[PDB]
Amino acid sequence: AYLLFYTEAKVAAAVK
Amino acid sequence: AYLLFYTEAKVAAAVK
Amino acid sequence: AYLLFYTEAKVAAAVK
Amino acid sequence: AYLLFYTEAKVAAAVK
Amino acid sequence: AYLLFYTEAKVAAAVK
Amino acid sequence: AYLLFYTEAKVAAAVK
Ligand SMILES: [Cl-]
Ligand SMILES: [Cl-]
Ligand SMILES: [Cl-]
Ligand SMILES: [Cl-]
Ligand SMILES: [Cl-]
Ligand SMILES: [Cl-]
Numbered sequence A, B, C, D, E, F: 001a002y003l004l005f006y007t008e009a010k011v012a013a014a015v016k
Helices: none
Strands: A003-007 A012-015 B003-007 B012-015 C003-007 C012-015 D003-007 D012-015 E003-007 E012-015 F003-007 F012-015
Touching: none
Parallel strands: none
Antiparallel strands: A003 A012, A003 B003, B003 B012, C003 C012, C003 F003, D003 D012, D003 E003, E003 E012, F003 F012
């Protein structure tokens, strides 16, 4: 799995 | 587009 | 341009 | 000291 | 567990 | 001071 920080603003995290 | 930081280590960025 | 994450708290993003 | 970004969501920062 | 980005430089990630 | 993560790639950090 990847660790992911993403935003378009708040930064949200996800582990996919 | 969304700004993305990702890693499996080095953190890398992308703009998608 | 640069991608920037910054904070003094919430992390905010910018593309400059 | 180390710079730290952490989350369980909102990403938060710390300088320890 | 927490998702963690940390640095003293390279940013490294960890999931604790 | 601000904590800054930035990149044009590797993510680098600064405290200003
Ligand atoms: Cl916001
Ligand atoms: Cl590495
Ligand atoms: Cl605060
Ligand atoms: Cl939230
Ligand atoms: Cl380095
Ligand atoms: Cl490159």
